[PDB]
Amino acid sequence: AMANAVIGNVVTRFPPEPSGYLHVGHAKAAFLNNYYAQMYEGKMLLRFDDTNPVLEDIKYEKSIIEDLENLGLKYEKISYSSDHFDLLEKYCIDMIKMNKAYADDTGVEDMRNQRGEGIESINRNNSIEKNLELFNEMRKGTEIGQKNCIRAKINMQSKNKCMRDPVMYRCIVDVPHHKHQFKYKCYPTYDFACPIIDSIEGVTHALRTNEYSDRIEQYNWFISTLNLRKVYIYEFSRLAFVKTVMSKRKLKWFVENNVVDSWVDPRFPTIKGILRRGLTKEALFQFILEQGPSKAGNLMQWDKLWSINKQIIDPIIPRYAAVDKNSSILLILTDLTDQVIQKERDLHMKNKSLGTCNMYYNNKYLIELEDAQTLLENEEITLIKLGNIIIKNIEKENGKIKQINALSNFHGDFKTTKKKIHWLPYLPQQLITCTLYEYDHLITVDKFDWTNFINFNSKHETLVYAEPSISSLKVSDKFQFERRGYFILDKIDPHHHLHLIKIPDG
Template sequence: MLRRGLGPLRSWPRRQSTCVMSGNAYTLHLPSSTDASSYPLCSLITAALVNWQGDLKVNNHIDQTTASSSSADGEVRLDLPSKKTFVASDQSVARLLARLTNDTLGLYGGSGSVAMSSVDHWVEWAATRGGEGGALGELDGWLKLRTFIVGRRLSLADLAVFAKIGKQSKFQTDHLLKAYPHVKRWFTFVYRQPVVHLTLCELKVVQTTAALSGGLPARGGGGHPHKKGPASGGQSAAEAPSSQFGKLEGGVMGEVVVRFPPEPSGYLHVGHAKAAMINNFYARSYNGTLIIRFDDTNPAREKEEFQEEILEDCKRLGIKADKVSFTSDYFPQLQDMCTKLIKEGKAYVDDTPQEQMRLERGEGIESRNRQNTVEDNLKLWDEMLKGTPKGQECCVRARIDMQAKNKCMRDPAVYRCVTDIPHHRTKTAFTAYPMYDFCCPVVDALEGVTHAMRTSEYADRYDQYKWMLQACGLRDVHVLEFSRLNFVNTVLSKRKLQWFVDEGIVDSWKDPRFPTVQGMLRRGLQVKALWDFIDEQGPTKANNLMEWDKLWTKNKQIIDPIVPRYSAVGSDAVLFHLVDGPPEPLARVRPLHPKTAEVGEAAYFVYKNVLIEKDDAALCEQGEEVTLMRWGNCVVDRIDKDGEGNVTHMEGHLHLDGDVKKTKKKLHWLPALDTRLAPCVLREYDHIISKKKPEEDDKIQDLANRNSQFDTAAMGDPLLKHLKEDSVMQLERRGYFRVDQVYWPGKRALVLIKIPDGKSKPMSAVSTKLDPAAMMSGGRLGGAAAAAKAQNGQ
């Protein structure tokens, strides 16, 4: 268990004693892993020492991959200022750092060849014999009358041996040292050294972050929102797992086949996600088959890029297809089927201009070509298949009923001619392409689909779907309808979303303001929250415009119990000097989560100079007692202001015996250790359109919110530097955030995207660029100007 109150860091510099630019810094590469044994612990502690008390600048960089940055034989990578790379063992990299720094640290045991050779001996001993029981007996005898292994201060020998023993689990270490009292005393003493202890705390954060980012429910394959059904078939539908969506009519365990048929003309959005997740739910519940079929029948809009992204999005949603197919795989069969319909008089070829055809269908007027002979129709069909100028004027229409009340049954088109754009898979092999209303039911039947899930917007096409199956002589398919998922203040039309991308209002289809799967996950949405929200709606067919607050409230319920807590203050924070505060930073340990011990612990520092939010400082009064979170009470003795009334400096004294329950203000803060704090950009987003419910005749150009990204420059807890991309955390009194861009020393700041929490009120008095009440109610948000972006990490 980590101890609190570890004492001050000796000679802690508020800034580096030697001004070292980022280009002259060394970079030690660390793996993004939950396995402590994969970390170069000796190098890490050595780097921390030379950073704080020496004259070198060593940055730790976490490789954003699950694989270790070390090679199979345990080598460690150190980037040198000369742009060269030093790759060697953990101990060798630590030796290099110790040799490069000044002699005052004494990492080589002080001056003299004997001391240096002794350190080298024990470093080699740690690498070759440190874990052996007999070797520990030898070490125990050596330490009987010694505090340190070599000399009278902490040296590289201590760090190397400590690292060797410390890589084991706490249980293993305690068990191993039980028989060696002097080693145990020495190990505990080294462990309590502030620099060593802080390094271990930071390492714990890296491990916890790696575990959490992969362990949040159903993120990136880290879990599945749906249960898998029994492994054997022949069972009744009554035995299927329960859900708000209920059982499938005619569903037989082990025999259900469903399909998700996206068009590869854009990224998946939240409406597609609902369809995909419902199909996946039934496939798993009935131990059936899920087909992802790309409806690639419109070469003018489709790209292979979208196809690949859709498959990746399905993986992100925890969906794994049992089969991936393409409508284009069935072009020959569909073409033959259309020929059969023409020969049987169930379809005809029409060269009526498109606009005239639309008017005639609306008024129930038969086309002049409806009574063409089969021979005439086949000739025109052949022109379409050859892509001739005449064929390009034609389409094939199903002969159903031009007087039907359901206008979808008024001779819909089933084939069209496209010659100017090659298909991304079949190239120029075909010039006639099937329409969705024709190919969807036909391919459903050909692929053995038992249940077709469709949103209720296709309700008018139900009779048309059934007619196509009957006309083609194909087996029946059960159709299950559900409501489309629509939200306020956004659009789901791919054409309109593409407009936002083309206009540069958003950066891509993955923008966090977009209702795409990738956009919403980038905003911090957890897949389980999305599924719980969808499942709660059940099988209703009524299309409703949903508010965002319920979805984000569910998301908060998932992340709140498991994400770590940190602090950050704005770059305009006010210095609060505590006259009786610790003159040097004093290390302490805190839980990363107030209720969930499994999240881990982290080090923090109390110090005479702290930074508090400008907004908090403005509310403080002289003589007032306030609470500094995780420290205690203090009294504000003096407040300095500039000519405009802005607080520029505060002074006070500690009153740690004061009752925190009686103070009105609970303030988060950071120690004023400038070079240690993490430069951050706190990013918030507004809605992309200003109208809650757009009408059909609204122009997207008039509704677009062109000022919907707001950045706040901030300074964060030093531990934030170790977080990896996609990590989720809570910044105290600011809200929940997701790491969108990792910190890169001297090159770029940490970018944190704020995750909505469903609340209509801000968490604290700390200012925000957005109005939560307006955001949750769907109204347009306040238009405060964005703060200067901290694009470079300094």
């Protein structure tokens, strides 16, 4: 929401942590921050949220940047939360001097329980000078410092759990920070860092997933307690899908146990994986704008997303033909010659804009086995884009159909017939060999021994022959295979062997 937004003067920010790849969850946040900045002719910041040290097997900044670019989302400037550590320490000391923060040595358990029943910690009435001595203990990372945290002094009997003295600063000496190594011994918490950094970076409208705690009241308290320029904060609903593993632990488990080969595998929820699967950014954003709110912990179905994507791509992608390579059946039109005839057709029967292709045909054709099995003698069918034929005799040898002889009747009425089938010309030196990948979800349950619900058999490969014209497609082109479905060209192997990912269609 854009409470009191001023045209030309809105600043939003997308703040992903830099210890992982962007995934579809991130997408709603990135999109809404851009949608509202553009609505008000404002700007969107990119901020890498690195307030606390992590052990990162990579610097994900570059991948996050390129995913944002691939979604069309541009940002005015890039910052890191850790850019503001010194300022945040300043503000922590300010808090301490106004008696709005104190140092607490209480253990984890005792502190959680105290907060539950609303009893004030023994240290809540520590003196300002003592709180400062202990904060400096934390700053230098001494034995005493590592036993202390800084907490906000708010209201322990508040109805809101987030207002009962939330931690502001922790002392962490063992894990190094990806930017500052061990230069910092204490680190601000997310709850403290977030409002201050928003105010001092010039954010006007902070957007955030609803975490179903009233963190908004606490955020505002920090801004008002410290007398900072005010920031509006609004919480939207999280985007999460059924049958989708988001736990980083389980995702790396997949990678390491060779269920998938990389984090870009098309079954992964990463932005790259799902674009590899054939989703358009236009579909993602339209789905987001149209989905409406969702309540706590609800999970979307994939069907409306892939149906929107289908409606988008159907009118602007070319159509080709493909048959099963190993089980295709030879069809002979015994009235024609083996002279190869070549005729121009539209790549799209309703969109001459995408242009023309060349169609080759012969006396000899390949058709699908399941199509051959339905044919019987003196049946008038239609070879799509070519014309009617009349089947003559099905030459079956020991049950396995081996041949079908027919006769051209191309000038017959293509409406009379009810069987319309796709075909390839039998020109093996020109047909394109392709591998087709039909993917399925990595787990079988909508949500969570979990290894018991992994679909290890979720990458189905099949080998096909495709029409020659498909040679013109470049990597990441999307298209339709007649009577088969929607596909995206993923890779061109040696000898122009194509690797094609079936796009879910809903």
